[PDB]
A paper describes a structure:
For the seven pairs of ortholog structures (with no bound ligand) solved in this study, the average overall Cα RMSD was 1.5±0.5 Å, indicating a high degree of structural similarity. This structural similarity suggests that the ortholog approach is an efficient method to obtain useable structures from otherwise intractable targets, thereby lowering the barrier to structure-based drug design targeting infectious organisms.
Author numbering:
A (entry chain C): 1 to 202, 218 to 279
B (entry chain D): 0 to 202, 218 to 246, 250 to 279
C (entry chain B): 0 to 202, 217 to 245, 250 to 279
D (entry chain A): 0 to 202, 218 to 278
């Protein structure tokens, strides 16, 4: 199944990989524009399809007082300016059923947060909003169970679903990426595009190389100019200056493996 | 060990006689709820075990939009109101949306945060703000030392009456295992919150229940059904309730009068 | 289920009063061995708990070839002979090489298969052939239902006196978690072999784990102790032994007179 | 980092073209061994991939004491001598008991420490003292940063020619997952030992092999058989032999590409 996101950007497991790349959360217009512009410049140079990613709300910080981002209303204003400035499609996450329709007016893909992937009403609200849907696979969920979420989407008329790996629970706290999961998610859901979040899955290069070599529809990436200074106990973003170096290796492997067959 | 007063005559605490949070998966009819709740009340009253009746009014996380979800909020609250009026038993239920907490708190005696939702700031705050004691289910993805953050969110909005509920940790794909070292970790990192063990969702129910009760905990969380084979995770057969509870009580009374080592 | 006669008045069985397999990590000196065992003997005699003294004569799997390995076979067996002569207690020790089994079985009353060697056909067969009861340590990588194949190898060469020993299961990197449901799976898939729980290797929280395992209803506890474990995984502080054991006996005596559910 | 010379024209190293350590589960007869080795030689030659033939002379841990164990030490070494004589290939086998190390080392070119026995001091020392390169199998219970203890044991008795072989990690009961982050950790914590990936035991063979090879490693470890379904084992299934060329051509293409890409 190939999922058409915007003109010239289509995701599919046999197609050239799509970078879903951006930042953790919207803090300001200018900072968003500058980071997005650098993503655009690099992906344009290399010839990699690109969807810009950001959250408008951090809905699950440790403290009710922790910074949560600019929020829904201002976030969608920022996304509108990004789309106008760069002609790039955008993807963002949706935490509450009531956000789905307003977000769908602006965003080109709506993401189901991993912890919320089983919540029927949220998933239905997101699926009914009429845009392609990216389902984050929670660390507690095996790859053959994601089909139920895909089915809930199809039951309310949305067949344009993508599935995003971000690791599996491995003891306490640690995540392991089972590289056999990508095919199992694809094959049990009718061939949904599979995307790999190499940021939350934690050596980013080892992991991204491993995942791209398997043969997948997309990469999911967060970046920052200075990741070590994040005001976050979240997982480290890629340092932004490393983007081109990373993506040139990804494209090289991706172009190679996408012309190699399965074993007969 | 902080103790949490649920009602007169029911108080949960890690040094106190265990409390049974028992009932059924989801509310379906007044008739069946009363049937099951009445058996729990009679057995617990006979054995002398503090009791809080448990049920969901909605199953918010089923695999299909057409899969039966239960009677829903408005009818659920009416059933709980009857359960309370007829038996004088306190009740606990789970809350899935922020806007549900206030109306639920008018009837329910304890509000539960669903496991998958434990990290969501707005839902937890709405539950905590509703002013009843809160039961936080520990997600299978969460280590026992991280639950303190959810509790702190509750404290941050004025609710210090928080209990923690164990239901297993992810062990490979699909399977859950219960780390019995987790109960003390949960308790000691949260200032001594009552710890509760869900022996149904964790899954040999007797083996697990015996093990958890022997550690010394505040409560057991249990679902039962008259015929769990032919119902559409597996509840205790309702006819085994008395036999299970008599062992739980026997072990619990023994261990709650034994100390830590020197 | 099946009972394993270890020595006169010491019999291990899942329905019988629990047996303590207790001692120390490794034999270092006669003096120290006698000091610790003497303490175990006096506490178990006082409390009325069947006792088997445990120690390795060699640490075959330590991180450097210069790391201290214990007194070794010849001297270790001499120490075990003294222990037996002086206290009249039976002893258990582990066997790392096939040719050690015959010599060890002249002195030791139970031979143990080390966890990492449990699948090695030739070692297990030599141990089973030596003619004493066998304790099989369940490796952290093995599921509870697979231990049957090791027990059958013992049976294939005429040794039907086999016990099984839980020490935890791999949980992510490095850490171990004890699945309390494993005891019954081990017992039921092996014709009811006695199941023993190593609370030491499985890991301040020795008490939580020990209470939980003893409450399931098992044949034995495996325990290592040391007078000053911090300044010496981590053994129980020896001065805590009587406190730990009095609680284990109390729980075991209670649960061993309770049935399965109807 | 470290390069281990196995024989003329065969050298394993994490920066070098990958080496195939390839063969069969156990030595059953001379002629079957020669035929299978002959097929590996033909394909590795055609493709230009360095090759070491692998086989066990004993299956030391079957479920039943009556189950077939292969030809045994004495006859196995006679078969190995003939393989070397006939094909000019180096060979690798596993050693289960201390006393087998010296006689095995007279014929074998690499001696392998079985995974379950990797912590056994006396076995590892007898293997290390035998004077040939050593392949330590990483047991599914051992974390990648702990393998350094085994390498140090080998060094303490004068053998610095050690390679480390990934076979998966325990993931719940029975299942294994391959953590693709472990390869670097094994290499960096041991002074740069060649890291090798057993795509057989670790279990979709192509997904896993593509992922591992893309990370950048010294070797692949593979068992094959003309009819794996009819194996008289309940062990993990061998690669069908007829798929060897197709698998290895993809491995070569990916390895050649990534071995000339830098760090970020």
């Amino acid at each position: 199944m190939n999922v058409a996101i915007s003109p010239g950007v289509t995701a599919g497991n046999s197609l050239p990989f799509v970078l879903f790349g951006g930042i953790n959360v919207l803090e300001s217009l200018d900072f968003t524009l500058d980071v997005c512009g650098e993503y655009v410049a690099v992906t344009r140079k290399l010839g990699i399809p690109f969807v810009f990613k950001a959250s408008f709300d951090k809905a699950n910080r440790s403290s009710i007082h922790s910074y949560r981002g600019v929020g829904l209303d201002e976030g969608l204003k920022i996304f509108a300016e990004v789309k106008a400035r760069f002609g790039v499609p955008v993807i963002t996450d949706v935490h509450e059923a009531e956000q789905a329709a307003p977000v769908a007016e602006i965003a080109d893909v709506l993401q189901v947060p991993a912890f919320l992937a089983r919540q029927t009403d949220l998933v239905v609200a997101i699926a009914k909003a009429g845009k392609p849907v990216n389902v984050k696979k929670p660390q507690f969920m095996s790859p053959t169970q994601l089909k139920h979420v895909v089915s809930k989407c199809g039951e309310v008329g949305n067949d344009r679903v993508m599935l995003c790996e971000r690791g599996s629970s491995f003891g306490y706290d640690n995540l392991v990426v089972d590289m056999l999961g990508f095919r199992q998610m694809a094959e049990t859901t009718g061939g949904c595009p599979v995307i790999f979040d190499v940021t939350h899955s934690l050596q980013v290069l080892d992991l991204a190389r491993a995942g791209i070599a398997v043969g997948i529809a997309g990469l999911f990436l967060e970046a920052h100019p200075d990741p070590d200074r994040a005001r976050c106990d979240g997982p480290s973003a890629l340092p932004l200056h490393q983007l081109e170096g990373l993506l040139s290796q990804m494209k090289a492997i991706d172009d190679l493996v996408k012309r190699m067959p399965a074993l007969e």
